Amino acid sequence: SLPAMIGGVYSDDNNLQLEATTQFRKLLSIERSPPIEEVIQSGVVPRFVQFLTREDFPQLQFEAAWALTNIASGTSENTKVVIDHGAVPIFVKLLGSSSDDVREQAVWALGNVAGDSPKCRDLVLANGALLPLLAQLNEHTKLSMLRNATWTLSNFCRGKPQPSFEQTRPALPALARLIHSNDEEVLTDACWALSYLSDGTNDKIQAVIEAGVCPRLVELLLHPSPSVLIPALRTVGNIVTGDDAQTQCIIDHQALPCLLSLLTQNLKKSIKKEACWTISNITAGNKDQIQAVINAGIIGPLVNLLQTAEFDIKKEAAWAISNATSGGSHDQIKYLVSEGCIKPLCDLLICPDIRIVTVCLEGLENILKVGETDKTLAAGDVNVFSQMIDEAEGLEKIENLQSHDNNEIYEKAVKILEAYWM
């Protein structure tokens, strides 16, 4: 019935225009491979874009917006054709429509176009879609629109190179409010949007923390759904990459006992990997920040992972442990040793990841300095931690690291041996 459809689309009668646009929308609304390319070649894309400007016929507007959204849902070439026919500024105008159905369709259309590539996202942002998108969001916004707007916002923040922070800055108060929802879809999309905004320099993190999201993000670390957990953990993780004061905003809302529960409960390897990485950037902090990790009871489970977990988790547990030896006090480091961090740190000296070997060598060197200070204070004839590194088969591994091709590993191995085994 395609000739009657093209004919109906290309007619002047309001009844024929609607029935044929509805038929194309239903043809493109099928869940098993829609004929997007074929609907384009029938030349109805420019006529559907003309139907968007029919303010007197909001129902035709809606079907045309649906069909175009499904055309824009296809390959990169299909989205480009929708762009070429100037639909992007018209969908931005449709965000001010009196019809909620049309406004909702305009939102999903813009999210689809923006989701295609960073270039398409920048064109949507350049046509000023952000401010009218936020203006139609308030106390009486229905869940369907809250779900579409949050997804679209996430597509505006997604992609590498990241969008301009000044371009996406107005979305921060809205996302701060949206993460207080109980809806699993809104929480997912809001958290992903905040994980993109939070990734970058510390001035970006500062605007994220000033939006007031830290308390609620920590609560979302306990969300039973991994769809919400994963982007919330990513956002908390990005915030703790910041300075001591920014990292403290996460610690102040009991994030460390939450992070610990992710390590002990039976979750996916990638979840635990992210949780260890987050902890590693906390132990990269000041003495009080390392003390909060200790106070939470994290060292015990962290040392076990460093010793027994899958390599991707061990890698991150090594950074967490060694970062604490870098910024920790004499006693804090003695507490890491009492929790048995020496053997698992030594065991990784033979791992094929060069950076982890060097992370473990620096952690062990900082441990040896504490043991050397104890040897000077007690006027002892032996460095306790030298014998512990020897007993763990660490000394033989360090001795063998002198035969290594990597200059960072080699110079560290020689420095350690000349200082504690001359």
């Binding site: 970058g200 990459t241 910041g242 990269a284 952690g363």
Partner: peptide, 9 residues
């Protein structure tokens, strides 16, 4: 020397 804060990738 190698230890400290790490940004995402």
């Amino acid at each position: 020397s190698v230890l400290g804060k790490r940004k995402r990738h």
